[PDB]
Amino acid sequence: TIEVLGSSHVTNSINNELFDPLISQALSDIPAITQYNMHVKKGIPVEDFPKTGLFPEPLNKNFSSNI
């Protein structure tokens, strides 16, 4: 952690770099019912969805976590 005492701009920049929505969305996936909500109930087409599902697949189920 890098801290600067008394500056909200540092906190905003650090939170933007650590939790950038484009890369965090790329390494994750949208829920299916949420996808049905924004496609059918809101009219957004498929091609302007944010890109998802780019995380690599593990070898087993056993290799998915350190616990």
Partner: protein, 443 residues
């Protein structure tokens, strides 16, 4: 039954309660003064007070140098970290040799920590997300919260998560009817398996079936962990295990060694000292064993002079079998055991001595009775004379072909004819050199 390899008849130094050594005890024969000196060194390590004490084991080949270090490691026990090493291993192609030496220095100081965990666990009963008002706004995720209902034994809790925890949950591929395990220290989620409250025989993906977890959903448990300083240094230099982007992409790229700075080691030392001050942690110094120390060159020796004077260094044990040889990386420096005199001034040399006919004979007896072999007395005397004539290791390594040649004749006892046949079939260094000298085309 088991597998034996050049050792494992040695269990310890075999000393008394007052430090004196029995002649035949602990798998050792002879070497009384060296065993007593190693016992004094073992007591010094167990005192847990000193830093950077270094000794050197000197003597000829097949005299019992590495056996003493292995006996030291067996006498100390498994709770003390012991790091075996060979001098040729410090020459890496990814990082400089100084960093490899300092990493192996920090790998020999252990730490025992009583840490506590915050755990949410149970069987998933519901999984409903709530969407955001502007999904294509560019800033912020698609969802806002996710409602998760967990049910354990005599308990039921409902949780409201951010998208950050739910991203790891759906990376674990969590469905309805699974038993999960959320660790609040790092956000890590483990999917234990399907619950046994439903049907079992209608699956196709070799899952395991888990009963409901006992106790409440929210828990606090104490775990005793055993780590080293090098583990903390490596985990802080290459961060993994967070839920941010940087620690997530760190698990996917290829790992590589890096030159860890002194500032990171100082900060890790500060945090560890703070943990000790609260009565949580406890320091366990250990032993670093560098075998074949003549393979090092002058730069590693000059850095070792600096590294021994630090206030954290463990006990270093070296071994060498050179009389008066030139130090590697130099031309004119001739020093005993291949070790430069400024490093020799900081050591404590323990001498090892060669054996006799009786010690060779009883060592052959011990190695034969370890390997589940039955040897006659005349064959034993023949092997003892063979060992004194050529080498101890050549007599030790000829036991198993003798046993095979005895077994192939439907026999259990090893006799003189098997030893003569093994003499004929297999040679040693002196007879091979004799064949090499009287030969035509570079045999």
């Amino acid at each position: 039954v088991t597998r034996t390899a050049a050792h494992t008849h040695i269990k310890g130094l075999g000393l008394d309660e007052s430090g004196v050594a029995k002649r035949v005890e602990g798998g050792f024969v002879g070497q009384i003064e060296a065993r007593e000196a190693c016992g004094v060194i073992v007591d010094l390590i167990k005192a847990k007070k000193m830093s950077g004490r270094a000794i050197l084991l000197a003597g000829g080949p097949s005299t019992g140098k590495t056996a003493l270090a292995l006996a030291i490691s067996q006498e100390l026990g498994p709770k003390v970290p012991f790091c075996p090493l060979v001098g040729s291993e410090l020459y890496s192609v990814e990082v400089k040799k100084t960093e490899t030496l300092m990493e192996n220095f920090r790998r020999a100081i252990g730490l025992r920590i009583k840490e506590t965990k915050e755990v949410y666990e149970g069987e998933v009963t519901e999984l409903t997300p709530e969407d955001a008002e502007n999904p294509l706004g560019g800033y912020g995720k698609t969802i806002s919260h996710v409602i998760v209902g967990l049910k354990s034994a005599k308990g039921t809790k409902t949780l409201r998560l951010d998208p950050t925890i739910y991203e790891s949950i759906q990376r674990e591929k969590v469905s309805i009817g699974d038993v999960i395990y959320i660790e609040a220290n790092t956000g890590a989620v483990k999917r234990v398996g399907r619950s046994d409250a439903y049907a079992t025989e209608f699956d196709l993906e070799t899952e395991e079936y888990v009963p409901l977890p006992k106790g409440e959903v929210h828990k606090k448990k104490e775990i005793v962990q055993d780590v080293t300083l090098h583990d903390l240094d490596v985990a802080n230099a290459r961060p993994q295990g967070g839920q941010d982007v940087i620690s997530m992409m760190g698990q996917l790229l290829k790992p590589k060694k890096t030159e860890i700075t002194e500032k990171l080691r100082q900060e890790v030392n500060k945090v560890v000292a703070k943990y000790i001050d609260q009565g949580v942690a406890e320091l366990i110094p250990g032993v670093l064993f560098i075998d074949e120390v003549n393979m090092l060159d002058i730069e590693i020796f000059t850095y070792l002079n600096k590294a021994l004077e630090s206030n954290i260094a463990p006990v270093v044990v070296l071994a060498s079998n050179r009389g008066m040889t030139t130090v590697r990386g130099t031309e004119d420096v001739i020093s005993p055991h291949g070790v430069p005199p400024d490093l020799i001034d900081r050591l404590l040399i323990v001498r090892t001595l060669p054996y006799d006919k009786d010690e060779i004979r009883t060592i052959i007896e011990r190695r034969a009775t370890v390997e589940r072999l039955q040897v006659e007395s005349s064959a034993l005397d023949l092997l003892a004379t063979m060992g004194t004539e050529t080498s101890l290791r050549y007599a030790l390594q000829l036991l198993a072909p003798c046993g095979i040649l005895a077994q192939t004749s439907n026999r259990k006892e090893i006799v003189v004819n098997d030893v003569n046949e093994a003499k004929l079939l297999f040679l040693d260094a002196k007879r091979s050199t004799k064949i090499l000298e009287t030969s035509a085309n570079y045999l």
